[PDB]
Symmetry: D2
Subunit: 23 residues, 4 copies
């Protein structure tokens, strides 16, 4: 369960990084 | 470009973590 | 500021993954 | 072993994000 939650958190961070890159 | 590549790398790690969790 | 915060989060996740691996 | 390696990668990514933020 913690591994899956971390994976979700990494997916979310990835989205944030893509928004940062585009801005 | 580095931000987007890191995002890809995080997405890949997330997949790896989900496989690790399931195993 | 966002990047520095993300970096902090990734470092904490790494710490947690190591603890998970240690048992 | 995989988890420890992922942790290492996330730590390097964090280092790089901080450098990107520093200019």
């Amino acid at each position: 369960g913690q591994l899956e939650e971390i994976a979700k958190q990494l997916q979310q961070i990835a989205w944030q990084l893509k928004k940062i890159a585009q801005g």
